[PDB]
Amino acid sequence: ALWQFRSMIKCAIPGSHPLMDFNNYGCYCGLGGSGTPVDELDRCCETHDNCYRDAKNLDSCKVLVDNPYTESYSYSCSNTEITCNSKNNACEAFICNCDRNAAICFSKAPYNKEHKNLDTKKYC
Amino acid sequence: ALWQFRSMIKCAIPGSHPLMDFNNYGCYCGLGGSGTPVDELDRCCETHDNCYRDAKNLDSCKVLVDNPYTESYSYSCSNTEITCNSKNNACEAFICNCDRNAAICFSKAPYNKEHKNLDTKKYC
Numbered sequence: 001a002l003w004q005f006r007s008m009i010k011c012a013i014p015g016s017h018p019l020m021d022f023n024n025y026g027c028y029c030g031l032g033g034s035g036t037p038v039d040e041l042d043r044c045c046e047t048h049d050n051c052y053r054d055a056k057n058l059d060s061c062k063v064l065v066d067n068p069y070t071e072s073y074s075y076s077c078s079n080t081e082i083t084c085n086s087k088n089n090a091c092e093a094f095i096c097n098c099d100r101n102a103a104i105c106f107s108k109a110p111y112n113k114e115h116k117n118l119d120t121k122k123y124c
Numbered sequence: 125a126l127w128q129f130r131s132m133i134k135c136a137i138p139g140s141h142p143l144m145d146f147n148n149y150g151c152y153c154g155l156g157g158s159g160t161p162v163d164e165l166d167r168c169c170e171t172h173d174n175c176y177r178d179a180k181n182l183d184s185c186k187v188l189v190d191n192p193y194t195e196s197y198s199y200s201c202s203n204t205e206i207t208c209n210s211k212n213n214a215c216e217a218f219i220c221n222c223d224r225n226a227a228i229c230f231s232k233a234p235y236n237k238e239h240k241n242l243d244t245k246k247y248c
């Protein structure tokens with residue numbers, strides 16, 4: 001669930017303010033995604049968006065989960081490392097994974113303040 | 125999640141058709157619940173209805189869980205026994221239990237074919 005994803009980003013990026021820093025950044029980080037991602041951080045959001053789309057194609061996600069952004073999974077934050085519980089169901093494990101990889105992705109991408117709140121009709 | 129509860133009913137009552145047999149039975153098995161339950165099977169539905177109402181008032185569920193009929197959990201069916209997996213968080217464990225106790229409840233109550241499709245306006 002989204003609240004878990006916000007906590008994974010604080011895990012990997014201590015002292016980050018997830019909603020404030022990464023929402024509405026470039027063409028993909030936020031409600032939609034269209035156009036060409038404008039940097040490596042936007043590309044992280046674009047993969048996370050496709051990750052969620054692919055999860056919805058799994059049979060497991062179809063019968064068991066309604067909304068990925070609301071579905072709680074099991075993961076842990078050890079120090080700065082994220083781990084998805086091996087005992088999560090197959091749909092929960094796929095979501096957990098998408099989130100884990102995005103979080104690790106954001107921790108290595110450079111942040112471009114200029115891309116924050118970019119006009120999505122103009123540039124995307 | 126509802127698909128999981130249907131599955132636990134077929135675990136405990138091998139060969140039942142959960143929607144066909146248990147939906148729209150007495151006063152509580154179905155969308156609503158009002159009145160006095162008409163029999164033991166109906167009291168199972170009633171308890172499961174209250175179970176979920178309590179689930180919602182659980183802090184970890186309270187704010188952190190969208191809707192309990194939607195949240196997926198981990199459980200397993202061994203032969204005819206249901207087990208809620210220990211990986212589940214407070215919210216999911218609570219849900220899985222509401223579900224597990226109802227399926228066991230159903231497996232033990234007597235079924236009055238005469239209460240299937242009881243007029244809810246008239247009798248509840």
Ligand SMILES: [Ca+2]
Nearest residue numbers: 028030032033
């Ligand atoms: Ca997006």
Ligand SMILES: [Ca+2]
Nearest residue numbers: 152154156157
């Ligand atoms: Ca009911």
Ligand SMILES: [Ca+2]
Nearest residue numbers: 072073196197
């Ligand atoms: Ca779950």
